[PDB]
Design an enzyme around this catalytic site. Structure first.
Site, PDB file in Angstrom:
ATOM      1  CD  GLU F 106      -3.358   0.140   1.752  1.00 40.92           C
ATOM      2  OE1 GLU F 106      -4.563  -0.127   1.570  1.00 40.92           O
ATOM      3  OE2 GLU F 106      -2.948   0.902   2.647  1.00 40.92           O
ATOM      4  CG  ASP F 107       1.104   3.695  -2.831  1.00 38.39           C
ATOM      5  OD1 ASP F 107       0.904   2.569  -3.328  1.00 38.39           O
ATOM      6  OD2 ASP F 107       0.865   4.754  -3.446  1.00 38.39           O
ATOM      7  CB  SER F 108       4.767   1.528   2.891  1.00 42.01           C
ATOM      8  OG  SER F 108       5.745   1.790   3.858  1.00 42.01           O
TER       9      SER F 108
ATOM     10  CG  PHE I 133       0.505   2.117   4.821  1.00 41.15           C
ATOM     11  CD1 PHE I 133       0.045   2.411   6.091  1.00 41.15           C
ATOM     12  CD2 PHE I 133       0.362   0.827   4.346  1.00 41.15           C
ATOM     13  CE1 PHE I 133      -0.549   1.438   6.874  1.00 41.15           C
ATOM     14  CE2 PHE I 133      -0.224  -0.155   5.122  1.00 41.15           C
ATOM     15  CZ  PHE I 133      -0.681   0.151   6.390  1.00 41.15           C
TER      16      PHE I 133
END
Ligand SMILES: [Mg+2]
Ligand SMILES: [Zn+2]
Ligand SMILES: [Zn+2]
Ligand SMILES: [Zn+2]
Lengths: 76, 285, 44, 100, 42, 339, 62, 41, 474
Positions: F106-108, I133
RNA sequence: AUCGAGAGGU
């Protein structure tokens, strides 16, 4: 009055909160299970049994009230 | 009772490079050597600068960092003592055991700019010096009237706390390859197809024969385990004309060092600290 | 013992040799941590 | 800290299995040991786990046949590994010398 | 001791003086670094 | 050239139809409109690098300068013509899209903790605090204040200290701390004494800091991992930053992948003047050309490489895609947000 | 900024080489026929040189 | 014809001649040319 | 009106911990405390906590006394003197997210101590909340009264809000990495010995019986089914017409393209309705790190080969576009029924392109199939960019498509091509023409204005429908 | 201390 005889989760939370607040005011426990670190565990083990010192008084929208003891009520 | 018996066979050595070929051991040993070399073999490097006149264009904490990363000769590294131990000192200045101090000073007093390189760091233990290689690692440039004067305290460390203190510019291994060509399916292909099988290899493992014009593996070592030659074959139809699979003992390790510790004595030094590790986890009884 | 504003040294610890200044409870010359240590762990 | 670097805890339900916790160690030790515990006939199950990826501790679990206790094997492995290294050191040293 | 912005001159500063380089008159003055020693962890 | 007669004029270059902040993006026509819009409006403005040549004559409230700034490997025509280098603010990072123990979902973003300590993405933030006096600047008859109310150059000032002291004095608030880098005092013609103190803090990427690429993707650092644990490659190159394979299909940026491939091919040794280094927005190098470069370099035509697991040493089944991309750091740091 | 001391990926020491890059480049060497003779061979390292903006020459003048 | 110029020459040109633009004019020419008219003519 | 307790910071991912555990930084935990009354059952614990100077202050009657340096006398315990203890492992807190209709966003989680400054939120809590996130902010509060403590530990706990009052199914939906790992693990039915042993380690119990005992070249070889069994609870009986279980013993497990998610959803719903929520939480906490480790060894990534154009299929798609561009002349003139037929034809061509595109190994395992949005976002970035100029949107003016695009196509293109409005042939992987980029930017601007209105007006709608539905209670 | 405006992550 009530045929289902099922305790709602809100009344259960209320009675556990008031039982923890009572046991947290320099009062002994009814069951012989002392020695816990938190009052939440004491309240949970107390409500897990049937011997509860206080009961709940339900209210009716018509303008009356009916008593219901915790001894006859069953908890999930 | 159960115990492997690994066997090395060095191919090139120099003070920075070393390519040894371990045979007969599990990958789990070679990986461990890699890992420990990268981040436990200890080295000595600068770890508390104290600056008194910076006049330069670069701020103080960019001079610090830069200083630390400078590679400092540390043969004595394994014999020192992590400061946090040494109770022979308050942690300042030379302590034969745990720290070595390096004063530096410079001020430009001409016109053309002065490069405060690393050959201008002077130390007081003549062991820990900076590594020399042809002019050294510029730490700042100063213009007329500008000055730097600093005193630094080196210390010993493990590269798992910062990488100032890590003695390797890449250690790595390659499961040596095993190549088998079906040699009769490979008779089926016409010349052209072959020369478009040869030249679909990213690197160069394969290679045509002068004479019989057959594909002849001509350097097994250079096969990155891509799947290209294989998958071209599938497409050409003939499947499994060439099957290539890792041998799973033979590795070929390649260590290269920052200069702090010679290559040789990086490996030997690893094996040694591994033993000291293992021999701490014995549960006695 | 000591006095306000002195420059002492952290003798033993993870932070060894660091120089620090004693606000009241020492403070390090270039980092923001206010550590407190007893006299035995401090030197001139 | 001083908590023992290695600690032993027998597993109650299954006989001949136990878990050892080694503090301040990581995948460098665990993978080397695991693979030698699997070189032994008596050992049935062997593995390591990091309890949380950010904490340096490994827990190693060994299940063995009746012929050997868990402790015996663990200790055996370490001893065996050490002896291997010595063979390598000797070998490497020999070679560097030759090269020169 | 402060040092003049547009020419290098240094002077102590008196409270309430409009900050002016006494010598040249521009009014920008910069403080100066003494030799005191500062430790930076690297 | 194909049909000279029918045309009266010819455009100099289709890349000049965009702005200054858009004509330099590689493969700008290869991404979604919203993504390139975001990258050319906010990610370009919030990128931290290259602040100022004379930094003493300036006393701005916040400034932020990269320790070691870098130019990108790819060359757009526009940058080549303008001949200005402040256009790109960031560093080249070797990325290997992969899933890493689910810290990169998730886009980390997960990054090597040893490239961030060998110096990458390190910034300095100089913030100035100011006051005015017609109350004279003085020392109230803290302890870093001198005989004029101003702290000594070099001091470390904490969150409760008095930075400028006026016989009522300005006290630093929560997120304010640092080492005094400059004390400048001046006055105007109306007889109003001024004074400004500038405090410097150096920071390294820490958890919670947002990063962004040249093609729109934006993420928060979520884990910092040691060099040893990361998957390696035969040559030994461990990826500096690892990003989720999942993000690429959902977002429509076929560009990031394409750029990375061009770059690797530019940087890789060949076994030398016919390299294609240009990714101008409307005349991008082709995919057939990008990939026949990597091949000549020695890497796999499609940009993927074999990776051997770090923790165990075993070859890993799926080839991973790894290449050099130009990343940027945002000014919105994690530390200020926490309260 | 001045050439960083060590490559940020593999930790080679490159901070010794800037000058000989530039010099060779001021002959007639394609970058990359030069970065070869300075013997850098992995591409994590041939990045850090081909993509550095000097910025100290200037900061000195002003 | 425009043949005998070739497709290289004429895309060298096109870069040689946009460095030039950016030398004469620059990148804030507009603002400047305006003020320098309010205060001239 | 303002509130006393408050905490806002950036959140990150942490999948190696239980769902009910959430991290907390050092300074936040040091500043805020937790009020609690002195009891008899914790007489020694409070003393051993107060002597080591971890608390901040204590209130006696109507006056408050701090616990800073300067006190030479021992702090004697009294039931009347209340104390506030620093938050440690064993405290409960609820969080507040950006406004979202669902009440599931509010949840009670146990606090976890660490050294960093950011908050750790597991990816399993992304479906109840709405925070990715990508830099989102949360508002983590603290209960002060013990009655409030009971209220937050009983009502807001995850062990009671599992059944959703909106959709009816479990809110703990499937994650991207979880589904990907499960697919790449089910693709290989049989495992090795060391690999199988290393995954079980993260399980709960041992694995005595192996699936494959002896073979020609392999010895003891296990399967993923026994790993899922040891990940399953002790005793359970699902009986969902496709899977049978009897005491952590899975019998059959069907394999499809997307039915695995629905199957495991039915499994977890049966597990929840049979035993309880704690068993499902333990099952998730035992299955997530195992799956994360399984994939990690294998690896997954997408290369440039996955986005293969397949020039033959590309020419086929171009011929289909040439065939389909004929009715484009009679779309914006007759009615909207032809527009719906055009949408149907575009959907059919998109499904054809998706079937021609999903032949790879990574795209099929990473992208959903039954979802239309995923198919659109996958086809639009590989080939045959969809229609982007329509007459149904009132956000823009009709002149932009009546006297602008035709003149642009006549100035720039050689042939007339009047029907070239949303029949662009370029894709995102290949070069995009300047006119195509202009049309795409117009479509993106239309999306953005629609989205802003979509966020603005339904807010007022929710306010209006909420100002009246606040007094309906059974 | 107060007000207003502008620029932002959601
Ligand atoms: Mg978001
Ligand atoms: Zn010492
Ligand atoms: Zn002057
Ligand atoms: Zn390198």
């Amino acid at each position: 009055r009530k045929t289902s005889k099922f305790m709602t989760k809100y009344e259960r939370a209320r009675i556990l909160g008031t039982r923890a607040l009572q046991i947290s005011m320099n009062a002994p426990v009814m069951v012989e299970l002392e020695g816990e670190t938190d009052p939440l565990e004491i309240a949970m083990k107390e409500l897990r049994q049937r011997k509860i010192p206080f009961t709940i008084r339900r209210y009716l929208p018509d303008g009356s009230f009916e008593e219901w003891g915790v001894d006859e009520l069953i908890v999930e | 009772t159960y115990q492997r018996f690994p066997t090395v066979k060095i191919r090139e050595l120099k003070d920075d490079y070393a390519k040894f070929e371990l045979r007969e051991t599990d990958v789990s040993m070679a990986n461990a050597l890699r890992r420990v070399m990268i981040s436990e073999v200890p080295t000595m490097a600068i770890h508390l600068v104290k600056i008194e006149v910076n006049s330069s264009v670069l701020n103080d904490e960019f001079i610090a960092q830069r200083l630390s990363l400078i590679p400092l000769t540390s043969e004595r590294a394994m014999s020192m003592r992590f400061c946090q131990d040494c109770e022979d000192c308050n942690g300042d200045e030379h302590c034969e055991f745990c720290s070595v101090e390096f004063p530096l000073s410079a001020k430009c007093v001409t016109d053309q700019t002065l490069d405060v390189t690393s050959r201008d760091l002077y130390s007081a233990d003549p062991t820990v010096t900076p590594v020399d290689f042809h002019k050294g690692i510029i730490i700042a440039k100063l213009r007329r009237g500008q000055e730097l004067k600093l005193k630094a305290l080196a210390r010993k460390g493990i590269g798992k706390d910062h990488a100032k203190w890590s003695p390797a510019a890449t250690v790595t291994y390659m499961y040596e390859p095993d190549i088998i060509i079906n040699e009769e399916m490979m008779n089926t292909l016409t010349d052209e197809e072959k020369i478009d099988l040869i030249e679909s290899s990213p690197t160069k493992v394969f290679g045509i024969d002068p004479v019989t014009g057959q594909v002849v593996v001509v350097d097994p070592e250079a096969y990155t385990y891509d799947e290209e030659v294989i998958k071209k074959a599938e497409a050409m139809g003939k499947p499994g004309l060439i099957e290539i699979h890792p041998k799973h003992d033979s590795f070929v390790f390649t260590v290269e060092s920052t200069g702090a510790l010679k290559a040789s004595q990086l490996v030997l030094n690893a094996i040694d600290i591994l033993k000291q590790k293992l021999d701490a986890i014995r549960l006695s009884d | 013992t000591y006095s306000i504003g002195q420059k002492l040294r952290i003798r033993v610890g993870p932070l060894k040799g660091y120089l620090c200044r004693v606000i009241a409870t020492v403070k390090l010359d270039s980092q923001h941590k206010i550590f407190t240590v007893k006299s035995e762990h401090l030197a001139e | 800290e001083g908590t023992k670097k290695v600690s032993y805890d027998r597993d109650t339900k299954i006989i001949n299995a136990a878990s050892f916790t080694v503090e301040r160690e990581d995948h460098t030790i665990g993978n080397i040991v695991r693979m030698q515990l699997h070189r032994d006939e008596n050992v049935l199950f062997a593995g390591y786990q990091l309890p949380h990826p950010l904490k340096y501790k490994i827990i190693v679990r060994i299940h063995t046949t009746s012929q050997s206790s868990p402790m015996q094997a663990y200790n055996q492995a370490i001893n065996d590994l050490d002896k291997e290294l010595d063979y390598l050191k000797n070998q490497f040293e020999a070679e560097v010398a030759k090269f020169s | 001791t402060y040092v003049c912005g547009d020419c290098g001159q240094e002077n102590t500063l008196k409270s309430g003086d409009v900050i002016q380089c006494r010598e040249c008159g521009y009014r920008i003055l910069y403080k100066k670094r003494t030799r005191r020693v500062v430790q930076y962890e690297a | 050239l194909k049909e000279p007669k029918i045309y009266t004029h010819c455009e100099l270059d289709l890349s000049f139809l965009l702005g200054v902040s858009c004509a330099v993006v590689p493969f700008a026509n290869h991404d979604h409109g919203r993504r390139v819009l975001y990258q050319s409006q906010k990610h370009c403005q919030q990128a931290i690098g290259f602040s100022s040549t004379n930094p003493n004559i300036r006393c701005d409230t916040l400034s932020q300068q990269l320790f070691y700034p870098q130019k990108p490997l790819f060359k757009t025509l526009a940058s080549e013509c303008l001949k200005k280098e402040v256009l790109f603010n960031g560093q080249n990072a070797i990325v290997a899209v992969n899933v890493h123990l689910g810290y990169n979902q998730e886009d980390s973003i997960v990054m090597n903790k040893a490239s961030l300590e060998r110096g990458m993405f390190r910034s300095e933030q100089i913030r100035s605090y100011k006051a005015e006096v017609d109350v004279q600047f003085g020392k109230t008859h803290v302890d870093s204040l001198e005989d004029d109310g101003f702290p000594f150059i070099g001091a470390n000032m904490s969150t409760g200290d008095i930075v400028i002291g006026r016989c009522h004095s300005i006290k630093l608030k929560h997120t304010e701390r640092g080492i005094v880098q400059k004390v400048v005092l001046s006055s105007n013609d109306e007889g109003k004494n001024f004074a400004a103190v500038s405090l410097r803090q150096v920071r390294s990427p820490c958890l919670g800091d947002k990063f962004s690429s040249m093609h729109g993707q934006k993420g928060v650092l979520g884990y910092l991992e040691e060099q040893q644990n990361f998957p390696f490659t035969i040559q030994g190159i461990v990826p500096d930053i690892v990003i989720n394979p999942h993000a690429f299909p959902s977002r429509q940026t076929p560009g990031q992948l394409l750029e990375a491939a061009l770059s690797k091919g530019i940087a890789c040794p060949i076994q030398y003047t016919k390299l294609t280094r240009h990714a101008t927005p409307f005349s991008t190098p082709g995919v057939t050309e990008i990939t026949e470069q990597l091949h000549r370099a020695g890497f796999s035509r499609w940009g993927n490489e074999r990776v051997y697991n770090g923790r165990s040493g075993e070859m890993m089944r799926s080839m991973i895609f790894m290449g050099p991309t130009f990343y940027q750091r945002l000014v919105h740091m994690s530390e200020d947000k926490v309260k | 900024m001045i050439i960083p001391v060590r490559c940020f990926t593999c930790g080679k020491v490159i901070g010794n080489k800037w000058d000989q890059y530039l010099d060779l480049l001021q002959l007639d060497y394609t970058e990359g026929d030069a970065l070869d003779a300075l013997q850098l061979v992995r591409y994590c390292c041939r990045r850090m040189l081909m993509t550095h903006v000097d910025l100290i020459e200037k900061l000195l003048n002003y | 014809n425009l043949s005998e110029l070739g497709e290289g020459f004429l895309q060298s040109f096109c870069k040689k001649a946009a460095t030039s633009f950016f030398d004469k004019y620059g990148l804030i020419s507009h603002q400047l040319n305006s003020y320098n008219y309010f205060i001239e003519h | 009106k303002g509130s006393g307790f408050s905490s806002r910071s950036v959140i990150t991912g942490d999948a190696y911990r239980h769902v009910n555990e959430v991290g907390i930084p050092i300074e936040i935990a040091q500043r805020i405390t937790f009020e609690e009354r002195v009891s008899v059952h914790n007489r020694g614990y409070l003393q051993k906590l107060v002597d080591d100077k971890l608390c901040l202050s204590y209130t006696q009657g109507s006056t408050t006394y701090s616990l800073r340096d300067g006190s030479k006398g021992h702090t004697e315990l009294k039931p009347g003197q209340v104390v506030h203890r620093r938050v440690m492992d064993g405290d409960v807190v609820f969080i507040n997210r950006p406004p979202t209709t669902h009440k599931h966003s509010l949840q009670a989680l146990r606090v976890y101590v660490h050294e960093d400054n950011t908050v750790k939120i597991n990816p399993l809590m992304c479906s109840p909340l709405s925070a990715d996130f990508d830099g989102d902010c949360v508002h983590l509060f603290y209960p002060q009264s013990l009655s409030a403590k009971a209220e937050v530990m009983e009502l807001f706990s995850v062990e009671k809000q599992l059944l959703s009052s909106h959709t009816g199914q479990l809110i703990l939906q499937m994650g991207s990495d979880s589904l990907l790992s499960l697919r790449v693990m089910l693709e290989r039915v049989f495992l090795d010995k060391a690999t199988a042993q290393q995954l079980a380690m993260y399980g709960s119990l041992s694995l005595p019986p192996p699936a494959l005992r002896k073979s020609s070249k392999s010895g003891p070889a296990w399967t993923v089914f026994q790993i899922l069994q040891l990940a399953f609870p002790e005793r359970l009986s699902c009986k969902g017409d496709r899977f049978l279980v009897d005491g952590s013993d899975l019998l059959k497990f069907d394999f499809g393209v997307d039915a695995m998610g629905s199957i495991i959803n039915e499994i977890v719903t049966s597990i929840f309705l049979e035993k309880g929520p704690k068993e499902t939480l333990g099952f998730f906490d035992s299955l997530q790190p195992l799956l994360m480790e399984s994939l990690f060894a294998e690896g997954f990534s997408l290369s440039l080969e996955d986005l293969s154009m397949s020039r033959a299929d590309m020419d086929v798609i171009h011929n289909l576009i040439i065939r389909e561009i004929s009715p484009m002349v009679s779309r914006l003139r007759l009615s909207y029924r032809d527009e719906l037929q055009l949408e149907n034809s575009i959907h059919k061509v998109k499904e054809v392109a998706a079937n021609f595109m999903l032949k790879s190994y990574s795209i099929r395992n990473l992208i959903d199939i039954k979802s239309n949005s995923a198919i659109t976002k996958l086809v639009q970035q590989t080939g045959f960019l969809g229609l982007q100029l329509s007459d149904k949107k009132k956000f823009y003016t009709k002149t932009l498509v009546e006297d602008m695009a035709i003149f642009c196509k006549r100035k720039y293109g050689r042939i007339s091509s009047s029907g070239d409005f949303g029949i662009v042939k370029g894709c995102f992987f290949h070069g995009l023409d300047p006119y195509e980029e202009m049309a795409h930017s117009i479509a993106a601007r239309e999306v953005i204005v629609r989205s802003s209105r979509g966020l603005a007006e339904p807010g007022t709608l929710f306010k209006n429908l909420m100002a009246v539905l606040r007094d309906i209670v059974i």
